[PDB]
Write a protein that binds this ligand. Sequence first.
Ligand SMILES: *[B]([O])([O])[C]([C]C1=[C]C(C#N)=[C][C]=[C]1)[N]C(=O)[C]1[C][C][C]N1C(=O)[C]([N])[C]C1=[C][C]=[C][C]=[C]1
Ligand SMILES: [Ca+2]
Length: 223
Amino acid sequence: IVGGYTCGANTVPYQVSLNSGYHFCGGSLINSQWVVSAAHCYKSGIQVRLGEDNINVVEGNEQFISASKSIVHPSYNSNTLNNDIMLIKLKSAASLNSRVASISLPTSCASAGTQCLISGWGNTKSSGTSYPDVLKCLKAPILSDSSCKSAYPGQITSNMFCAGYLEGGKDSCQGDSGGPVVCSGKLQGIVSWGSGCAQKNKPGVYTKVCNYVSWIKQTIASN
Ligand SMILES: *[B]([O])([O])[C]([C]C1=[C]C(C#N)=[C][C]=[C]1)[N]C(=O)[C]1[C][C][C]N1C(=O)[C]([N])[C]C1=[C][C]=[C][C]=[C]1
Ligand SMILES: [Ca+2]
């Protein structure tokens, strides 16, 4: 996250880190046994780390659980990033508590103007590299579809939305992928892609979660 702030330990209780020897992607806890992430985060050998703040220090609130299966969206396109969403089933159910908690799926899509919270352990520099050990947060509004499409001509589908600031300076970045955009207590977005980080007129682009609730529900019902 660029231009954000330090969340505070365990204040974002649905945030997970995906680890394959190191943190490589974020995700969100949707129930005691299921995580949602970006399909571009797919790989084998994923351990899901919950209850994290400092990802390099065991602080006492963590649950580390192996994934038993992952399901990439049937229509994921790796070239265009259309349908950038995947589900991961944990080997065992997490123990939910004040520091580890699920986030609710949306009943409705969120509208342009809504303020949201984006979080992750990704790079914190727009040019140059510095990866935080602790969780960073950013408040950002959802941008209009028009602003989005004009920022990225020909690249925005109905399954994507832009959030951030046209002026730049604050944005998601590398390492934040898969992570949550929460608005009014509902998971509305998944960190997906961007043209660099925090550049003017190039806001981060997010998977529109409200388009997938039926797929998610259906898939968790039979897996
Ligand atoms: B995620 O992997 O950590 C990361 C998040 C992110 C990256 C950038 C940049 N630059 C800005 C905001 C968020 N996501 C990416 O690296 C995604 C996944 C693969 C490539 N990518 C992009 O952001 C690309 N820079 C742009 C892209 C757009 C359409 C098709 C392919 C790549
Ligand atoms: Ca670690």
